């Protein structure tokens, strides 16, 4: 790996500099190098890892959707044949996206998840595993599409089971997991009713636990509760 010669602390420092400069590809490469040092990640370092790759793949997904929309329009009735170029370029972006997802899933599998024993870290990584299988599912069309969808479901489900046993209902990692698993149900698994039920039940159970929280914890939890409410409003 190109980052093998750099100190772990220097990679963490440069990941933070890249975030400040909005250089998320650099940020992800630095955090990939940090993970490959083999030590477990701190809470802050987990956020650096997730922020970097969320921004990288987020840009790829946005571009893929633009190109996929153009491609679908070119395949409509009455459209002039433009050649293979739109499909080729959509495929290029799709392949790069899949490469990033495979990279993240590889870091989780070798060996972040198996060494994560605390509920907070294990749920965080399993949520990430569900997320990046979900991104693969968004572009999947082949023989393994159902297996990709079930890999996302399985990761999300294990994270949910741990989070319900080991974390309070206002825990922001538990809330963000539920938010994303709900979106998985709605957009990937064609289960809008399960999506709505999960978002509402997550919101209500967090609402009843807010009284236990400090002002700062309250702000964290209510911010994600608002995202659950936003989705429920979009879906109902």
């Amino acid at each position: 790996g190109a980052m093998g010669s750099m100190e772990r602390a220097s990679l963490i420092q440069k990941a933070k500099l890249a975030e400040q400069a909005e250089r998320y590809e650099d940020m992800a490469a630095f955090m990939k190098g940090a993970v490959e040092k083999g030590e477990e990640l701190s809470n802050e370092e987990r956020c650096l890892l997730s922020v970097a790759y969320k921004n990288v793949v987020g840009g790829q997904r946005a571009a893929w959707r633009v190109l996929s929309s153009i491609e679908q329009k070119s395949n409509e009735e009455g459209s002039e044949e433009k050649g293979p170029e739109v499909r080729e370029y959509r495929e290029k972006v799709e392949t790069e996206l899949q490469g990033v997802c495979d990279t993240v899933l590889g870091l989780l599998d070798s060996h972040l998840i198996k060494e994560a024993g605390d509920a907070e870290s294990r749920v965080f990584y399993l949520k990430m595993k569900g997320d990046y299988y979900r991104y693969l599912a968004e572009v999947a069309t082949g023989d393994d599409k159902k297996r990709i969808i079930d890999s996302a479901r399985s990761a999300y489900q294990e994270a949910m089971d741990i989070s319900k046993k080991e974390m309070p209902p206002t825990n922001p990692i538990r809330l963000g997991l539920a938010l994303n698993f709900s979106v998985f149900h709605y957009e990937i698994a064609n289960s809008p009713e399960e999506a709505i039920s999960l978002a509402k039940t997550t919101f209500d159970e967090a609402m009843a636990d807010l009284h236990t929280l400090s002002e700062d914890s309250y702000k964290d939890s209510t911010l994600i509760m608002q995202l659950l409410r936003d989705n429920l409003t979009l879906w109902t």
Binding site: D131, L179, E187, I224, D230, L234
Partner: peptide
């Protein structure tokens, strides 16, 4: 699109 974190 719906919100995810």
């Amino acid at each position: 699109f719906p919100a995810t974190v």
